Each structure stands twice: as structure tokens, then as C-alpha cells.
């Protein structure tokens, strides 16, 4: 999933 990208998602 793209929303696990750490640049996008600081929780990942």
C-alpha cells in the first residue's frame, strides 16, 4: 500500500 511509504506516513 502506498500509504505505508515513510515519506508520506510518519507512523509507518
Amino acid at each position, epitope marked *: *500500500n*502506498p*500509504n*505505508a*511509504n515513510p*515519506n*508520506a*506516513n*510518519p*507512523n*509507518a
Partner: antibody
Framework: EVQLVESGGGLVQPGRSLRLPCTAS????????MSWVRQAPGKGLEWVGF??????????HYAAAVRGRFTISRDDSKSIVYLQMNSLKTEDTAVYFC??????????????????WGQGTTVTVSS | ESVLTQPPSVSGAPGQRVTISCTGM?????????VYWYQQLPGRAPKLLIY???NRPSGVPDRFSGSRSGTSASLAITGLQAEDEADYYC???????????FGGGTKLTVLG
């Protein structure tokens, strides 16, 4: 009640520095990433940067417009996140909002919207 | 040059329905990054209104709904009330700029 209180804003000359503390209360501060957003007078929201939680190293990520001039740090022992603004420019004039990144779980990842916003502190850069 | 765009303004009559578009690109919404919506009442800080494309915070009423499709997203507001007048912003991560982009905001007028 969850609260975020920014402080430290005011008038500053171009080229000078200002540090904005944001004091958090009412939630488990150390579990959350925190994020700064700004809004110039009459204009739209612009994201500034985020800082991860300390168990992820409290690493940071910034918008290109401020990279190299603004940095973020956090002090979990005091429940404060700081925006350090160096070499300020007139176009940095804005209200600066401190925000909490949510922890709600989605389908295989955690969501990351800004679920709590402070009231903001006004920074005016002028000579 | 923006990667997310919104109409500058929308209006509707009391009790009616408006939609606010968030027009994105293959580098943001089209790549599957989720959309978040914020409501900013006049003189107030923004509030999270929709998260993860379509989810409402527990206290936000179902008059507000969010959807996506391809490279765009939409916020629908039904049963318009005067208290809904605000600026609405969409947000999504963009791979080409490597950061959270915001649309330009849409000012909602409720024609009272």
C-alpha cells in the same frame, strides 16, 4: 481535553531566527508524530514539516520551501515540540499551527491526518 | 503550478447540497495516497473533517461525506446550514514533491 499551545511568535527582521515552542497536554505525547502547518494572511494552508515519535528516532521531514532553514525537534520530558526558524524571509510571514498526527488504524497501515490543531501563533517578518 | 487544485468558491442555498472537488494527479490521489479534508471556520484553526478518503471523526455528522475516484476526490455537504460557511481544504501526499500537498481551499457561502 487535548490541547496544543504554540508560543514565541511576533515581529522579526529578515535574516533573523525565531523558535516556536508548542506545549502539548491531555494525550500521550510521545506516541504521536507532530506536524507544523502555516497560513499566510488571506492565503491557503501550507505544510511545513513533521517529526516522528522517539521510538522511530524522532527523525524529520520538511517541505522544500523551508528545507535548510527550518528544523523541528521535540522534548518528550516536557511535552514540547519546537519549530526552529532560521534566516527568516518576508514570505515566511504567516500563522504557524502546531498539530498532532493521528494514530487511527486503517486497512494495513495507520492514517496520518492532523487530528488536533493549536490556535496558532503569528509570525511577521519585516524590516 | 499546483499538484492539487480546488475551486476558489462554492455556494448553495440553505438545506441544499454542494460538492467540493479536489483535483489531483497520478503523483498523489492517482497513486493511491489517501485524501484528508479540513474545515476552517472564519477566524479559527482548521479541524479534521474527513480522514482516509471517506471516514468521519466520531463527532462529525453524516451531512459531510468524502469520496475518491482515479486522480480526484470530492467532499459533499448536504442539508447546508449557515454554520457550515468555512474554507475547506483537501490534502494528499505527492510523490513528485515528496510532501503533503494542500489544495488551494474552497470558500463555502450559504446563500441566506
Amino acid at each position: 481535553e487535548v490541547q496544543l499551545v504554540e508560543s514565541g511568535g511576533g515581529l522579526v527582521q529578515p535574516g533573523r531566527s525565531l523558535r516556536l515552542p508548542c506545549t502539548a497536554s491531555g494525550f500521550s505525547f510521545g506516541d504521536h508524530a507532530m506536524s507544523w502547518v502555516r497560513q499566510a494572511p488571506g492565503k491557503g494552508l501550507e505544510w511545513v514539516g513533521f517529526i516522528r515519535k522517539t521510538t522511530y528516532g524522532a527523525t524529520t521531514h520538511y517541505a522544500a520551501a523551508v528545507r535548510g532553514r527550518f528544523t523541528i525537534s521535540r522534548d518528550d520530558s516536557k511535552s514540547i515540540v519546537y519549530l526552529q526558524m532560521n534566516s527568516l524571509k518576508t514570505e515566511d510571514t504567516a500563522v504557524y499551527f502546531c498539530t498532532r498526527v493521528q494514530l487511527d488504524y486503517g486497512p494495513g497501515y495507520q492514517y496520518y491526518g492532523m487530528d488536533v490543531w493549536g490556535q496558532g501563533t503569528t509570525v511577521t517578518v519585516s524590516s | 503550478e499546483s499538484v492539487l487544485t480546488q475551486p476558489p468558491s462554492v455556494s448553495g442555498a440553505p438545506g441544499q447540497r454542494v460538492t467540493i472537488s479536489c483535483t489531483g494527479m497520478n503523483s498523489n490521489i492517482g497513486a493511491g495516497y489517501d485524501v484528508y479534508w479540513y474545515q476552517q471556520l472564519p477566524g479559527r484553526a482548521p479541524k479534521l473533517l474527513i480522514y482516509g478518503n471517506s471516514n468521519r471523526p466520531s463527532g462529525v455528522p453524516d451531512r459531510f461525506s468524502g469520496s475518491r475516484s482515479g486522480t480526484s476526490a470530492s467532499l459533499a455537504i448536504t442539508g447546508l446550514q449557515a454554520e457550515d460557511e468555512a474554507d475547506y481544504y483537501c490534502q494528499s501526499y505527492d510523490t513528485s514533491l515528496n510532501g503533503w500537498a494542500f489544495g488551494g481551499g474552497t470558500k463555502l457561502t450559504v446563500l441566506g
